[PDB]
Amino acid sequence: TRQFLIYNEDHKRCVDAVSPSAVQTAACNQDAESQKFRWVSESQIMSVAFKLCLGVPSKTDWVAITLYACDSKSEFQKWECKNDTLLGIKGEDLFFNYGNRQNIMLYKGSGLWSRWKIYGTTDNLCSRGYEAMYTLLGNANGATCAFPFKFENKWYADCTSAGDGWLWCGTTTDYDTDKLFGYCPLKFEGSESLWNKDPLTSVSYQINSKSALTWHQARKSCQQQNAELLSITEIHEQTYLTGLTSSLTSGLWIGLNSLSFNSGWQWSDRSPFRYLNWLPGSPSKSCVSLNPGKNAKWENLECVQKLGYICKKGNTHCPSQWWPYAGHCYKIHRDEKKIQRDALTTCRKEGGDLTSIHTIEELDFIISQLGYEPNDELWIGLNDIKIQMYFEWSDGTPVTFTKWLRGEPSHENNRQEDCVVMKGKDGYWADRGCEWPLGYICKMK
Numbered sequence: 001t002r003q004f005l006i007y008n009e010d011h012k013r014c015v016d017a018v019s020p021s022a023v024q025t026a027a028c029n030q031d032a033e034s035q036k037f038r039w040v041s042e043s044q045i046m047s048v049a050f051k052l053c054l055g056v057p058s059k060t061d062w063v064a065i066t067l068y069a070c071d072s073k074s075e076f077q078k079w080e081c082k083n084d085t086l087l088g089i090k091g092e093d094l095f096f097n098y099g100n101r102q103n104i105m106l107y108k109g110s111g112l113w114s115r116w117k118i119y120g121t122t123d124n125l126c127s128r129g130y131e132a133m134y135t136l137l138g139n140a141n142g143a144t145c146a147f148p149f150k151f152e153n154k155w156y157a158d159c160t161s162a163g164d165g166w167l168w169c170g171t172t173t174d175y176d177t178d179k180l181f182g183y184c185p186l187k188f189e190g191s192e193s194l195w196n197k198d199p200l201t202s203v204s205y206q207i208n209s210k211s212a213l214t215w216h217q218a219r220k221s222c223q224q225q226n227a228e229l230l231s232i233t234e235i236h237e238q239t240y241l242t243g244l245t246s247s248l249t250s251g252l253w254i255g256l257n258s259l260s261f262n263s264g265w266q267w268s269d270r271s272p273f274r275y276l277n278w279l280p281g282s283p284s285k286s287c288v289s290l291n292p293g294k295n296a297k298w299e300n301l302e303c304v305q306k307l308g309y310i311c312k313k314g315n316t317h318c319p320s321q322w323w324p325y326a327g328h329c330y331k332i333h334r335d336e337k338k339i340q341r342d343a344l345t346t347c348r349k350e351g352g353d354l355t356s357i358h359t360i361e362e363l364d365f366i367i368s369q370l371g372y373e374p375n376d377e378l379w380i381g382l383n384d385i386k387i388q389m390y391f392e393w394s395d396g397t398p399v400t401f402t403k404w405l406r407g408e409p410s411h412e413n414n415r416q417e418d419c420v421v422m423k424g425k426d427g428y429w430a431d432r433g434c435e436w437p438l439g440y441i442c443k444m445k
Contacts, residue, residue: 002158003036003048004128005119008098010112014119015104017047020067023054023104028119038157039130040147043078043090046070051148051155053077056106059092065104070148081126085115133159134213134221135171135182136194142182142211142221145169150176159184166190185225195313198240203314205230205241209248211308215287218253218309219268228269229255230290230310235390238277238296241310245292253309256288256298263428264404269312272402274382274391276412319351325365327445330355332370332378334439340419343379343440344394352444353395354381363403366441367427374425379440382420382429388412391420395443405430 005028006015014028016035029035036048046053052067055077068077078090087096089106095114097107107114118125133145148155149170151162159167167184175181183194195204206227213221222228232238232254245252255268265273265283279297287303290296290310301307318329329352338346340354347353357363357380366372381394382402389412393399405428412418412431419434422441 002128003038004125005030005035006037006125007117007119008113009115009117011098015116017050017052017067020050020052023066025098025104030119038147039125039128040070041072041130043080044070044072044130045079045125046148046157048157051157054079056089056094059089059094061094061106061108063106065096065106081124083110085117085124086110087114087116087125131224132220133169133184133224134211134217135169136185136206136208136221137210138168138171138180138182140171140180140182142208142213142217143171143180145182145184146172148173150174152176159186161188164190185221196244198237200236201314203237203312205244206311206313207244207248207252207308208311209250209252209308212306213253213309214306215253215257215303218307219255221309222311225311225313227311227313229253229267230312231255231267231269231271232275232277233267233271234275235387238275241290242296245290245296248292250293251289251291251299251301251305251307253307254288254290254298255312256300257303258286258300258406259303262406262426264406264408266402266404272399273404273409274399274402276389276409278412280413322444323370325369326362329444330366330370331442332366332372332376332439333442337437337439338379339437340379340383340434340440343438344381347440347442347444350442350444352442354379355441355443356381356393356395356397357403358397358400360401360403363401363427366422370441372422372427377421377423377438379438380420380422380429381443382431383434384418385434388417391418403428 013025014035016026017023034049038046040046044053050067053070055068056063080090082088094106097105098113099105134142148157159169165188167186167188168181169184171180172178195206197204219229258265277297279299282299285300285302288298288300318324322329322331344354382391384391408430415433418431420429420431422429
């Protein structure tokens, strides 16, 4: 809910807008539209009944707070929460005050008459707060809703079904002039028809090809829909997404990025990066685009490019020299360096396997308790021997966690099979060819 009632505990009364020149108080009534308010920017509180913003004529003491036409550049319409429930103008020690019983006033006192809460709760007004709502479909290419907006010479404060029940908004204040609109990312009858569902996995995908947002704007649009940018974690998922996007050509943002400075490629939804499908030549630009014109393969671009995007909604005894953690025994070998398959065999001769890693806590145990050194480079069990570009663990356990080094995974089109190693001060992983003599990390039950 975006609409709240401004409440003062001490008087047990609520702000009520009577006219554009009168903002009084009255007995609280949630069924009275004149008492409902809403944020429309980082700093502006707007009346729902009148579609006018609360403001002041000057930043001076004891002036009347009345309703002004909303202006995102007006210093006199910007409100911020101070201390806790203190509400005051931006940049001054002047406060939203209950006023003399003989209209709401801007006053210098910070007493109980200047502390306001959202009716029905115990949180300040800034708790609801304004979040930009990126639009879906429409002609505005995913631009943000503009509140308030004018449609057929009426003012609208929230998303409307005015003019099937689909909720929409104008992305500029005068929709009657600019004719720019989009649909709101809210639940309504028919909202789920914006999502395409994979019958097999029950995961829903939303393809927003008409839009043109930056990578970060795209990430916000999915997250405000209780989703996240597309992560492609398995061969079936890529196959389905190739089918959905066969009839498209323009690039679409997906969640694969390398924006974290100490680590490499990762999905924004923290899914494991175990399936690769780069376009020939990539990765040569820290954000990844899916190119539906080239069979839905991936290429990395500058994160400020304006593209479409895809959202995704859904999901106690150890031998000698072996050390325990979480019901398993681990050991690092450095004596005789072996290639990956010879190391795989030696772990199995010893009763275990090349190590799998499923949680970050398990990764931390290896780099700090097993004698691991920062200059090391050790085999682990992740590999794509069977299917190129699809990493699996040699012990058959699921890949639920990946921590790639900066600049990793590297060059997969330079070789025919990829084994991965553990190297660096953080124990992050890097893939490489398998015919290299190296140390290795074994793990057993």
